């Protein structure tokens, strides 16, 4: 009566024993590729009708370090998908009340979102899926689970995905990931295809006019980019269930297998007095009026800290940036120096015998690497691969003072700074 | 009566199944750290008293593309250590004929030198080590070797390698790159300790006042940096025997083990009509002068047409840089282009349907990074590399014009061959 999940075979793969908290699993388990070092990652995107907020930065800031770790330290090969709930009730109601059209709001708050992703310097996906450009892909989509048997139609046009009949089948499970958590046959059914009043924006279809389920629009687009197995599908944890539990219940009825997705992560939210930013309470802070206050470094700062997959509390009016501006201080403190003694040695007149001082350098160095190493296998452990160089910072500045100078040596390691901090996303 | 070799166990190294050209086994074999993931590296450096040369230029820009694929694209942790040769009977003979100083001479020309890797985009090593900062832990280093009975002192004040004495143990062999290459016991015993002649610069020992043997200078250096084992020695082919083979015979004989060095990497020469250019033959063109007429991209693209290991033949007059140029013109305005593209993009506007195109595209695009991977793979193959590259830049170029542009598409494939260029050391 439990979920069973199959670890993707480590011969012909590229294997560095990194390890990943998988819902699935609900545990940290080692990360295999289904194929050769690639990674195919589909994350949720937002649904757009407002402006982004520092819960969505939190969001996918950690998945963009996430990603720079796997591609630009690991070297795996990302194809990565993020989508745009761009039809949606919000968006409706939204629209009525601005008196704009539904895809006029959409596409200028879709193109806040992007701009305030490369302000905070997060990176574009491989591939951009709005649902408005999916429509047809997902009416076949839902036309395929019907065949299968997995769903069916209600009098008035829509369309419900059928619990009782895909549990039945030995090689499904339904709530995978959070199974306590569960015109219709059952009240549990959810719909695929929902009749559209006729005021609403709707879509033809062979069930009659009406709009896609939440839920099989990112089934749909993933499916149709990365195919019928994804290495990694994040979100925020709010989505593991129902929506994220449903979509691997649509793509196993679609393609009629047991495991679409090996790894499912989710993000911690970040709350604000304890409470998940959200426009619905108010306690929101935009990420344009978070960068009238604080830098993009400094935000990343903040995120780095917090573990991915943890919750965080954020305190607002400062207090939690304030260790932020001082690590940030130090990175630029330490990088000025540093920089300048590169730029000004001396060749002519310096001695580059290797001193006792020099080999202790090198040799935390070296160490700092691997612990630096250890942190990101463990889960992306970015906390301590911070404090790590950190440490290391506080020795370089302490020789950079008083020692002589091996100037391959500071250029090495300012190399090696420079590498963790374009993992991080931090730019000096 | 045939030299043994150790491959190191691969039981906790990082195995990244590279594969290099190693003169110790005549052979392409399987590259294994001796330690986790580093490497321990030497390479030979320039004797400094005049101006350097394309020939150097390949060797040491050959060496840094090594160590960027090594660094940058691999991942290990690359401890390497250069010399610089500044006591030498040429520097000596320049002095007199200069008159400016035996010191001064020598460190001008360094100078000089360094300048000159740095015109190349070639990183400096994380140590330096300079023959006459050296000249104490030489002297050391021969009293080791006498007291291992591997070295014998003559009447005038200098001594000699007793090449048969080391021969005797059943844990040496000399030379073991090139076996049949082959006051003193024997003709074959080279100096670790000249006797001084009058007028010549000079340093005390205990054997009186002399100059270090040329072989002992970059045995000594290398083993007071890295110790008992590198992982890679290299220099250029003409220094196999007898310099590199003396090499491992004195550093042999001071640890009395069997193996000083898992992996002997001997860079080609570069020839100009077919032979070695060199100052003796009047044929050289300075590294200072072909900037004058040519770019860093554009030499560092000479050196990646040509496999590291073979040798080369450079045609002057342009022959040769015709083709250098046109790739490097060609990589120029790919960049102009692209960067032209994803600036006017408007998200506002476009659709961003994954079609066929896009996939056609991408499909390319994880092929080119698997075939650019194996090319690494096998024993550094930059042509091959560079070749993919450019095949790949011809798509990205014809999809520019004519379809649709995935934003997201086009900057993470621009964002890899940034990284690729980043590791050929080229700057657009
Ligand atoms: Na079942
Ligand atoms: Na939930
Ligand atoms: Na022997
Ligand atoms: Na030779
Ligand atoms: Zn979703
Ligand atoms: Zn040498």
Known sequence: SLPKWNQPSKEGKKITNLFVNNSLTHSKVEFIPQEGNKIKWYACGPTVYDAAHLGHARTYVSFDIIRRILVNYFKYDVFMVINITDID???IKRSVEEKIGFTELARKWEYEFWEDMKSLNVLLPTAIT????????????????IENKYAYVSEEGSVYFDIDEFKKSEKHFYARMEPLSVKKKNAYDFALWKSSKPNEPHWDSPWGKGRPGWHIECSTMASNILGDVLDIHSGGIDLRFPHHDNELAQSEAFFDHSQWVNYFLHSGHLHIEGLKMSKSLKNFITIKNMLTKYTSNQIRILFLLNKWDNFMNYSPNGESMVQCIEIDKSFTNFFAIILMKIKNFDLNSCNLYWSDADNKLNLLFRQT???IHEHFLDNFNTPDALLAIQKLITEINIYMDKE??????????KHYINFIFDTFGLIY
Chains 1, 2 share one sequence.
């Open 404 to 413: 002589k100078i091996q100037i391959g040596l500071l250029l090495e390691i």
């Open 89 to 91: 009730d919000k968006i």
């Open 130 to 145: 709005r649902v408005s450009e999916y429509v047809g892909d997902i009416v076949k989509y839902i036309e395929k689970i």
């Open 369 to 371: 690497k691997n612990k």
